[PDB]
Design a protein around this ligand. Structure first.
Ligand SMILES: O=c1[nH]cnc2c1ncn2[C@@H]1O[C@H](CO)[C@@H](O)[C@H]1O
Length: 316
């Protein structure tokens, strides 16, 4: 009865205020605007990955969307079994499948920009360390730390980045504990790249500011400024590393619907497509800080500066 897009995620939550929420929102917009339909399913454990993709393929969906590095192995296999079914992989790469499109993001380039903002706010308070909390480090996740460190060092090579890994994208309690550990050490800015877990990092920052501690958090995926309002007016969110997975999902769903699915291609959504970067409006960033950030953004887009894909501590 309708062209249908089906989303399979490893997360039990599409309202994570971040990544899964952006993907579902993009699929939802495509459906609403094109008189089509959509649905999703959660694959909590990997024993569910293959059967979940298979069921959708068995219903002859217009497009099957798989989110994240965890589902890659299952997509690689399943796409070969259903050569006529179109699949879209977000946040990972699949090769040798003419029925699969891989959407990847230049998140190292966008993270460079919030690294500049972080280093400037830290210097403002005489701090020589900033924090970074990441959900997991598999797949393309290391790009966030690589770019964040690069942006911080571009401002002041002496500022250290202190890293904490949660090893989960769905545990806010853990996010809060790791944020408390970093803030208790004297850090005043933390960039969180942790999906649902990250909501706990934002909560901890809100609680600290409420009681007079001059701390900040940088959000991810969505513009999380409102998520950080703690006293009715002010927000603890300095800025956010926005990642338009919604645009990717919506646009590729439309290509599938129209017959122009770019099967077998990896499409990079980067800083020049405005697919990653910071929000257009930033109440907590001064015009001077904004100028510095846009200056760097221009050099990255022109390739005058190339942002690494792995941080110093992860390189030989
Ligand atoms: O549930 C998830 N499954 C896989 N990856 C995720 C999930 N949530 C978040 N990310 C990854 O972490 C980054 C920051 O939130 C997201 O951009 C995405 O790359």
């Amino acid at each position: 009865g309708d062209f249908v897009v089906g989303m399979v995620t490893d997360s039990g939550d599409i309202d994570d205020k971040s990544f899964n929420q952006q993907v579902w929102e993009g699929i939802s917009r495509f459906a609403q605007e094109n008189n089509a339909k959509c649905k999703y399913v959660t694959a909590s454990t990997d024993a569910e990955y293959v059967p979940s993709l298979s069921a959708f393929a068995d219903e002859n969906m217009g497009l099957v969307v798989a989110c994240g590095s965890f589902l890659v192995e299952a997509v690689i296999e399943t796409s070969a079994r259903f050569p006529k079914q179109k699949f879209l992989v977000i946040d990972a790469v699949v090769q040798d499948r003419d029925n699969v499109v891989s959407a990847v993001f230049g998140q190292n380039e966008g993270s460079f920009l919030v690294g500049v903002a972080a280093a400037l706010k830290a210097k403002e308070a005489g701090k020589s360390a900033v924090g970074f909390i990441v959900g997991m480090e598999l797949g393309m996740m290391p790009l966030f730390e690589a770019g964040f460190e690069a942006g911080v060092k571009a401002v002041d090579p002496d500022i250290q980045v202190v890293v904490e890994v949660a090893n989960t994208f769905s545990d806010p309690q853990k996010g809060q504990a790791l944020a408390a550990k970093l803030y208790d050490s004297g850090v005043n800015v933390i960039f969180q790249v942790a999906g649902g877990t990250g909501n706990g990092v934002i909560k901890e920052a809100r609680d600290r500011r409420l009681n007079g501690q001059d701390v900040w958090v940088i959000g991810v995926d969505r513009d999380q400024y409102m998520d950080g309002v703690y006293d009715g007016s002010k927000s603890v969110v300095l800025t956010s590393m926005v990642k338009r997975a919604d645009v990717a999902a919506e646009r590729i769903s439309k290509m599938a619907y129209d017959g122009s699915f770019p099967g077998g291609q990896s499409i990079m959504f980067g800083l020049e497509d405005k697919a990653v970067g910071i929000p257009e409006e930033n109440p907590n960033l001064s015009s001077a800080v904004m100028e510095k950030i846009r200056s760097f953004e221009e050099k990255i887009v022109s390739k005058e500066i190339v942002v690494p894909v792995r941080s110093a501590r992860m390189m030989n």
